[PDB]
Amino acid sequence: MEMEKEFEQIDKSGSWAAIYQDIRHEASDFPCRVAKLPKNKNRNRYRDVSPFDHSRIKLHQEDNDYINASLIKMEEAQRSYILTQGPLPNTCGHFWEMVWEQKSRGVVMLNRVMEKGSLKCAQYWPQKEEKEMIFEDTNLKLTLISEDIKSYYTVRQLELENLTTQETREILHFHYTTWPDFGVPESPASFLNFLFKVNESGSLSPEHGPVVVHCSAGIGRSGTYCLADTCLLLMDKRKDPSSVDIKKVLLEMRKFRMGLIQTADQLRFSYLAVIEGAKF
Numbered sequence: 682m683e684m685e686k687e688f689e690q691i692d693k694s695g696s697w698a699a700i701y702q703d704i705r706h707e708a709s710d711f712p713c714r715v716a717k718l719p720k721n722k723n724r725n726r727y728r729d730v731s732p733f734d735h736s737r738i739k740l741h742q743e744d745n746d747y748i749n750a751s752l753i754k755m756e757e758a759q760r761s762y763i764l765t766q767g768p769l770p771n772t773c774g775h776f777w778e779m780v781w782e783q784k785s786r787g788v789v790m791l792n793r794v795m796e797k798g799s800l801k802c803a804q805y806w807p808q809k810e811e812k813e814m815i816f817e818d819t820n821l822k823l824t825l826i827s828e829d830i831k832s833y834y835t836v837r838q839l840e841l842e843n844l845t846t847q848e849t850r851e852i853l854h855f856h857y858t859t860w861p862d863f864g865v866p867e868s869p870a871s872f873l874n875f876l877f878k879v880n881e882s883g884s885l886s887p888e889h890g891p892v893v894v895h896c897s898a899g900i901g902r903s904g905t906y907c908l909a910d911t912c913l914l915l916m917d918k919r920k921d922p923s924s925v926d927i928k929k930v931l932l933e934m935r936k937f938r939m940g941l942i943q944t945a946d947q948l949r950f951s952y953l954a955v956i957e958g959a960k961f
């Protein structure tokens with residue numbers, strides 16, 4: 682296992698911080714003019730995390746098309762992802778409008794709504810069957826149909842209805858609920874099981890739009906999920922599976938959204954998840 686040997690070499694050298702800073706230095710820089718317009722100030726959760734203009738998702742209704750979300754198109758892996766921030770109280774209607782317009786059928790959430798007493802995301806889906814949500818700005822209704830609550834993740838069956846046309850769609854909400862409050866998981870086992878459950882659900886089917894992935898900023902935990910999923914896809918396809926270079930894959934994803942993988946510990950965990958998932 683070449684990656685397992687390079688991993689052990691990086692560990693033995695204590696050079697995760699060094700590799701991670703090289704990634705930061707080598708990462709693409711593209712404009713984010715739309716994100717920074719005055720009229721979009723209250724659409725961004727974090728002033729330092731913005732979508733590039735070239736890859737941002739545009740909303741189709743007529744007054745303001747902006748959402749803090751990026752299309753990551755991993756051409757060789759043959760999968761696209763939408764990475765987005767945790768919705769704000771005023772952007773939940775936009776979030777579901779994006780889900781509708783992009784034809785997504787899965788949402789991957791990697792945070793709890795509150796962590797360490799701080800809010801990471803608005804409560805953008807209904808917790809009770811009988812208390813559906815109506816987004817009057819985007820004319821959508823969202824109902825909780827059922828959920829399967831497990832020890833380390835929950836999968837919810839939501840019904841999203843376009844109130845204009847009365848069309849309905851089933852959306853699966855894949856909520857990883859156990860990422861630690863600080864740092865990364867000690868073992869990737871639970872995270873891998875979750876990733877495989879998302880894949881097995883039929884959500885990443887090329888018949889549907891891209892999966893929507895978020896955490897609080899849509900770059901750290903979300904970057905780890907995207908990076909691990911993309912590397913596992915490449916290994917399951919490439920003639921030489923050991924030729925998958927995780928640093929190069931990450932730099933490719935960073936052409937589409939800034940800041941993906943926010944710490945050297947996230948980078949090490951991504952390597953560890955890919956190594957362990959490849960064995961599986």
Ligand SMILES: [Cl-]
Pocket residue numbers: 718719720721
């Ligand atoms: Cl403006």
Ligand SMILES: [Cl-]
Pocket residue numbers: 705939940941942943
């Ligand atoms: Cl960064």
